[PDB]
Design an enzyme around this catalytic site. Sequence first.
Site, PDB file in Angstrom:
ATOM      1  N   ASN A   1       0.792  -1.240   0.000  1.00  0.00           N
ATOM      2  CA  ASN A   1       0.000   0.000   0.000  1.00  0.00           C
ATOM      3  C   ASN A   1       0.822   1.287   0.000  1.00  0.00           C
ATOM      4  O   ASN A   1       0.253   2.371   0.134  1.00  0.00           O
ATOM      5  CB  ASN A   1      -0.975   0.013   1.169  1.00  0.00           C
ATOM      6  CG  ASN A   1      -1.826  -1.231   1.251  1.00  0.00           C
ATOM      7  OD1 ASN A   1      -1.976  -1.836   2.321  1.00  0.00           O
ATOM      8  ND2 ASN A   1      -2.390  -1.641   0.110  1.00  0.00           N
TER       9      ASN A   1
ATOM     10  N   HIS B   1       2.963   2.385   2.215  1.00  0.00           N
ATOM     11  CA  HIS B   1       3.268   2.935   3.537  1.00  0.00           C
ATOM     12  C   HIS B   1       4.508   2.216   4.078  1.00  0.00           C
ATOM     13  O   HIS B   1       4.741   1.059   3.727  1.00  0.00           O
ATOM     14  CB  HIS B   1       2.089   2.709   4.515  1.00  0.00           C
ATOM     15  CG  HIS B   1       0.826   3.398   4.113  1.00  0.00           C
ATOM     16  ND1 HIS B   1       0.665   4.761   4.280  1.00  0.00           N
ATOM     17  CD2 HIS B   1      -0.285   2.893   3.527  1.00  0.00           C
ATOM     18  CE1 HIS B   1      -0.533   5.042   3.794  1.00  0.00           C
ATOM     19  NE2 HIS B   1      -1.143   3.950   3.330  1.00  0.00           N
TER      20      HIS B   1
ATOM     21  N   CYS C   1       6.042   7.450   9.394  1.00  0.00           N
ATOM     22  CA  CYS C   1       7.128   8.124   8.694  1.00  0.00           C
ATOM     23  C   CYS C   1       6.752   8.029   7.216  1.00  0.00           C
ATOM     24  O   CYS C   1       6.501   6.932   6.720  1.00  0.00           O
ATOM     25  CB  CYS C   1       8.470   7.445   8.980  1.00  0.00           C
ATOM     26  SG  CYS C   1       9.808   7.857   7.814  1.00  0.00           S
TER      27      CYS C   1
END
Lengths: 263, 265
Positions: A185, A187, A222
């Site tokens: 995804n 991330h 992050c």
Amino acid sequence: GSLTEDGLSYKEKFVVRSYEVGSNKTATVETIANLLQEVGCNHAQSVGFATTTTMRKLHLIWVTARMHIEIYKYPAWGDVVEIETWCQSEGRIGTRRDWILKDSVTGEVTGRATSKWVMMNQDTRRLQKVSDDVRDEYLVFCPQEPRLAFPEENNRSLKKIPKLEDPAQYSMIGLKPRRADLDMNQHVNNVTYIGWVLESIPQEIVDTHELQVITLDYRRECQQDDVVDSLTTTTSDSQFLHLLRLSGDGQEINRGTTLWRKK
Amino acid sequence: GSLTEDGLSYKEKFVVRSYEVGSNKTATVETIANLLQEVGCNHAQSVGFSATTTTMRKLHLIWVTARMHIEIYKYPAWGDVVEIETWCQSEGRIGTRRDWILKDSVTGEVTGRATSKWVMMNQDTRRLQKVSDDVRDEYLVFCPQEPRLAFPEENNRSLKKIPKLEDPAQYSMIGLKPRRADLDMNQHVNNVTYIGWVLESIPQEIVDTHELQVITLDYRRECQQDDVVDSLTTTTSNDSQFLHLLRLSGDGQEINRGTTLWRKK
Ligand SMILES: O=C(COC(F)F)N1C[C@H]2CCC[C@H]2C1
Ligand SMILES: O=C(COC(F)F)N1C[C@H]2CCC[C@H]2C1
């Protein structure tokens, strides 16, 4: 692997790989952390999942808030490790996913983990309590009687972690994620934070001690174009207090503790 | 997995994992590269190499990668089983070659293939050397005698000379450092990390619209644990071609050079 006879937990056997081990020729804590998230995914897929019918209509996801891992023996390169995983309700606070690592030959428990997950909107990133209509959709896949991997009343997984005070004793600055650090995804993978935390542990501790306990608190994600600073201070066996923060403004993203034992 | 009936090759089936896939929900080229090195290690262990001979251990000698070439036609999806077959072959005193064939476990079709060139080197001095006859005889009995090439073509892309990238580079990713997850059991940087560092300077738009078809990598030097790398890329071209260069952040000492070929999704 497969769901157990009652359908309330999932088991999977993993053979430890050559690139998955460290200098001691046993699985790293990031390899263990990768194996825990893999058996958790297969458990979700095996019962039709990682969101419910309501969750996808409301743009809701389960996000990690806290991860606690205790390892007594790291599986060697070539060894088969059996991980059993299950989920449990914590009412409207969120969900808990627990794991038990076993030696496939002896049957002994070689490690265990517990994680706290919270409901969040994918877009605004705003926290949310678990609704009843969501609880009804996943309760049928969880044990009703409590089944705790860490059952000790007032244990290491529920302890409040303080914020590290500047100046830190140790630090690893300029840490950035690469494409291998992102998930499907886009991330940053939750395991990357474990790696970044351990980057500020001095090499001498890594060469002489073994990581026994790691507790991590997830405060902020992050981004792909962010730079992290990993800070560490000895609070003591060796004990450490950790802090991951953005390189620029110093915005906190993670805090944690580690406990190490002499080899 | 296991050695084949003739003991001259090894096969292993891998189930692709959730964290092993990218945006397209198919295995990354670094996951494929990790699986190739894993099937290569099990082949060595299955014939008594846990990866040097008695002569190599006595002379402080090791096999080091000099070049890696990977061509992928289909990336296995998350949950799919991929079957990799691997073998080794002599190149006289130049070194050894390790070849791989990736297959779809359901259809049996070839979904990718790789070839690598390995050279003998002294562990301590890092000085290369030719394969001695004493060493050659110790491992020839585990290799096919008749040539068995993964990339047999008359004018294949695995043996093409790679030029050095000229400054200024079209793209760049600066300040790249290895973490403990990038090191192997011997504390050296894993050869797969270089693949990722090379791809870090490929613009995100190419990654989102194209699929990596061919990657050729030349290994010139090893990046130490306390070294910082700069990844540089320039387009040399429906298909996109790139020329790459990994070099030390400071003095600009070359560590790798390579090429990639991508195709529209
Ligand atoms: O993803 C979750 C909740 O967070 C955490 F527990 F994993 N799940 C996955 C679904 C399959 C197992 C029961 C359901 C709960
Ligand atoms: O690892 C190698 C050769 O180096 C490199 F090419 F991989 N080996 C290990 C054994 C596998 C069958 C041939 C034997 C030589």
